[PDB]
Design a binder for this molecule. Structure first.
Ligand code: HEM
Ligand SMILES: [Cl-]
Length: 393
């Protein structure tokens, strides 16, 4: 028998304080039934991690949101990559993997680091900044669209585009309804920047499009792959970075450790990703009857994975509720795991690294000073505003 719970993990109350209810999702049993949305979920590390690693049994091609693409109409034409199963996923995955290769990262590290240092310098002149608008938002908007090869005009549509994409994986609540009602201009902006003549030479977009010349992909597939990175590749990194700064604001000890060995920057970032888990949840759909956590679940059933919970499971993590910048963070699910593991993880790490490295060197203290405000989203977890005073080194 599977435990029934009344917890609504897509509700404003849940978002505002998820941690008690997350314990209850874990502690009820390895598999629970969410009364509210009529679906099964798993919130322990072990089940979440095992579900990721068996795409044959737990498919994505039926949507990674509540909606089941076999029975219901997708809100937009499905992602080629996020919403496909091997073998179909493989070709496009390989395409995005080359575009975002370690080697590509080497070519862009220095520019990214330069901006990250310039950015921090600038903020110290001001003293009082908002770590979201001025830092977690400004910094990635300052490097990632250029790196994509996007034109100046229309950029304002990127963050709201992401929000919509991420609201849409959820149940049909007001967050979701409202996002879709207001989708058209964002979609029209992105559909236009996905086109070849609009991506600057040598940027991710053009680089994507080059795969059409070799036959690696069709002229039609290219824009839809550009659309993938315009969906997933900004807002996550905004929330990951905001997580990191939020953490070092709350954990002064850890900041001094980081100041003390700036080479901890990359791992300090990884640890914020675990701890806050920017992307909180994703679904899968069973392709057969399957035993998971000791319960038998039938074919064609949606299963909710609580990535952020898994990342806080005391079964897997020593002292899960602590931000610890030397934690062996290897194994966390914040980026997913297995075939679909975040193909953009290296851009994200690069942003996080250099930002935390610049904060490491240039800043001696980071204090919260003001109302912290949360941003509600069906999938993404993060802040709207985090007012901080930065003390210079
Ligand atoms: C802190 C930042 C980020 C986080 C936490 C994050 C999180 C994730 C997670 C959890 C998955 C797994 C999806 C699944 O299993 O169904 C994923 C996949 C994906 N990510 Fe990210 N991501 C981040 C940044 C980025 C960036 C910078 C890009 C691109 C530039 C990106 C693009 C993608 C794409 C295209 C997929 C689909 C991969 C596939 O299905 O093979 N993400 N991401
Ligand atoms: Cl779209």
């Amino acid at each position: 028998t599977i435990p029934h719970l009344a917890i609504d993990p897509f509700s404003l109350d849940f978002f505002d304080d998820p941690y008690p209810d997350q314990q209850t999702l874990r502690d009820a049993g390895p598999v629970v039934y969410l009364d509210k949305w009529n679906v099964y979920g798993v919130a322990r590390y072990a089940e979440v991690h095992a579900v990721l690693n068996d795409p044959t049994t737990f498919c994505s091609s039926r949507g990674v949101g509540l909606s089941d693409f076999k029975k219901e109409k997708p809100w937009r034409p499905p992602s080629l990559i996020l919403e496909a199963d091997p073998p179909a996923h493989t070709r496009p995955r390989a395409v995005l993997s080359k575009v975002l290769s370690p080697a590509t990262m080497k070519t862009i590290r220095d520019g990214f680091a330069a901006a990250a240092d310039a950015k921090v310098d600038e903020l110290l002149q001001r003293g009082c900044i908002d770590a979201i608008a001025d830092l977690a938002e400004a910094y990635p908007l300052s490097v990632f669209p250029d790196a994509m090869g996007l034109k100046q005009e229309g950029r304002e549509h990127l963050l709201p585009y992401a929000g919509l994409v991420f609201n849409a994986f959820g149940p049909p609540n007001e967050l979701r309804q409202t996002a879709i009602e207001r989708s058209a201009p964002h979609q029209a902006y992105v559909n236009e920047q996905c086109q070849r003549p609009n991506l600057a030479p040598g940027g991710f977009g053009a680089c994507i499009h080059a795969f059409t010349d070799t036959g690696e992909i069709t002229p039609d597939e290219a824009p839809l792959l550009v659309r993938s990175l315009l969906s997933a590749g900004l807002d996550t990194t905004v929330n990951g970075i905001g997580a990191a700064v939020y953490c070092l604001a709350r954990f002064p000890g850890e900041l001094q450790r980081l100041r003390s060995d700036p080479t901890l920057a990359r791992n300090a970032f990884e640890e914020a990703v675990r701890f806050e888990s920017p992307v909180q949840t994703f679904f899968r759909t069973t392709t057969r009857e399957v035993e998971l956590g000791g319960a038998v679940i039938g074919e064609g059933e949606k299963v909710l994975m609580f990535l952020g919970s898994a990342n806080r499971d005391p079964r897997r993590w020593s002292d899960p509720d602590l931000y610890d910048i030397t934690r062996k963070t290897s194994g966390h699910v914040g980026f997913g795991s297995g075939v679909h593991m975040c193909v953009g993880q290296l851009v994200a790490r690069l942003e996080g690294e250099v930002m935390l490295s610049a904060l490491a060197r240039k800043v001696a203290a980071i204090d919260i000073d003001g109302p912290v405000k949360r941003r509600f989203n069906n999938t993404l977890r993060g802040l709207e505003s985090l007012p901080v005073k930065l003390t210079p080194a």
